[PDB]
Amino acid sequence: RDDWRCARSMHEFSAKDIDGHMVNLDKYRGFVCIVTNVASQCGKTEVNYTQLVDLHARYAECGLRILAFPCNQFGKQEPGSNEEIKEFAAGYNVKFDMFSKICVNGDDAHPLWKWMKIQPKGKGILGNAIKWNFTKFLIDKNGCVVKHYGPMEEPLVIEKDLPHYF
C-alpha cells in the first residue's frame, strides 16, 4: 500500500515469522535490533551467520535482538522453502528471530523494508534498492534506523556502534 511511508518506527510494522505466524514488531520496543536480509547460498553466508550468532550470544543479555529476513532477489541465493531455511539457520546455532522469506526491493517489497530504505541520510540507503544479500540496519530502542551496513561489511563492524544505543 502506501501507509508505510507515514510510519516513524519499526514498531508500527508486522511480519510473518519463519513458521508462518504474524509477529507484531512492537515487541522489540526497548531493544536494540539488527535487521538483515539473509541468503543460504551466498559467498558471505558463513561469515554473516556466524558473526550474527556471535553478536547475539554476546549481547542478548544487554538487549540486542536480531531479525533475519530471507530474500531470494540476489543471485537467487535463497531458493529454498521457509522450512528448509529454518533448518539451515539451525545449523549455525541461530537463536535470534527468523522470518518468512520476503522481497526487499520493488513493488512487492515488505513494507518494513520499504520504510527502512527511505529513512534519512546515513540511516536509510541510497537509490531505494538493497544491493545484495546481507545488508544490515541498526535499529534503536525506539524503532528508528540509526545506521546501515552494506553487503560486504562483516556484522562484527556493528559492534563498535552498539554502546551508544543500549
Ligand X SMILES: *CC(=O)N(c1ccc(OC)c(Cl)c1)[C@H](C(=O)NCCc1ccccc1)c1cccs1
Of 158 and 162, nearer to ligand X (C-beta) is 162
- Rounded to a whole number of angstroms, the minimum distance from the CB of residue 163 to ligand X is 3
- Rounded to a whole number of angstroms, the minimum distance from the CB of residue 58 to ligand X is 7
Unique residue bearing C-alpha cell 546515513: 122
Cα–Cα distances in angstroms (integers) from residue 1 to residues 5, 107, 115, 148, in the given order: 9, 9, 12, 24
Of 43 and 63, nearer to ligand X (C-beta) is 63
- Rounded to a whole number of angstroms, the minimum distance from the CB of residue 31 to ligand X is 12
Interface positions with ligand X (CB under 6 A): 61-62, 162-163, 166
**In the complex, which residue's CB is closest to ligand X?**
62
CA distance 73 to 153: 19
Report helix, strand and coil shares of the chain as percent, to nearest 5: 35, 20, 45
- Rounded to a whole number of angstroms, the minimum distance from the CB of residue 54 to ligand X is 13
Of the candidates 128, 87, 85, which has an alpha carbon nearest to the alpha carbon of residue 109?
128
Of 62 and 152, nearer to ligand X (C-beta) is 62
Of 90 and 157, nearer to ligand X (C-beta) is 157
C-beta separation of 156 from 53 below 8 A: no
